[PDB]
Structure 1
Amino acid sequence: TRAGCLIGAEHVNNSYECDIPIGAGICASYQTSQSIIAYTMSLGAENSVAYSNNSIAIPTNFTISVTTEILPVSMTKTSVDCTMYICG
């Protein structure tokens, strides 16, 4: 590979959504006997919108979805005693 060479995993010619980032696009995953494969990661699907200046796509239905996301605000506030820490 570009970051070296991978010893212990076979190199396949497939392209799936990878989970373990190896490096320089290489990705490993335990997938079928089953073993660790080494394939180039994909960027999603291969959708191709048939664009034409005569048609439009207007949605008819809608699905309400509730998405969550966490965000840290504070930490554990501490205070060390230097005289006792350095010299007990």
Structure 2
Amino acid sequence: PCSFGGVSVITPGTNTSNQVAVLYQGVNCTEVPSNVFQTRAGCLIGAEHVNNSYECDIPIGAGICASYQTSQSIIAYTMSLGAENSVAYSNNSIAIPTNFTISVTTEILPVSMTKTS
């Protein structure tokens, strides 16, 4: 059967911009034909691929995430896992906190849904 697959639209809120990207899922996109990027989740058209890494904003798949950034456009990148940090381990060294901060965090949980008959 002819090549087929789902198509997804990557977009920021229309209240911010009108530019969109198109992700043909599971398609080796040599068949689709400067912004063509062959992901591991198909092919992405309409976004610029950069080597810089950020936190994932818009999930694309297979380690690729999109974002809207400056000149403004949609950028696809390999999502950064977090800040790099090497712990200064040694067999006779210790760290002790000399100061503290009391932080409040909000945790929100649904308790019930609307009764219906």
- What's the TM-score once normalised by structure 2's chain length? 0.65
* Aligned length in residues: 79
Higher helix share: 1
Partners of 2:68 and 2:48 in 1: how far apart? 11
Partners of 1:78 and 1:4 in 2: how far apart? 42
Structure 1 segments unaligned to the other structure (5+ residues): 80-88
Note the C-alpha offset of 1:78: 1.2
Which protein, 1 or 2, shows the higher relative CO under an 8 Å CA cutoff with sep ≥ 6? 1
Larger radius of gyration, structure 1 or 2?
A: 1
Per-residue CA deviation, residues 49-86 of structure 1 (Å, 9 max, x unaligned), is 0100111000010000010111011111111xxxxxxx
Per-residue CA deviation, residues 18-48 of structure 1 (Å, 9 max, x unaligned), is 2111111101111121211111001110100
Partners of 1:44 and 1:26 in 2: how far apart? 15
- What's the TM-score once normalised by structure 1's chain length? 0.86
Structure 2 segments unaligned to the other structure (5+ residues): 1-38
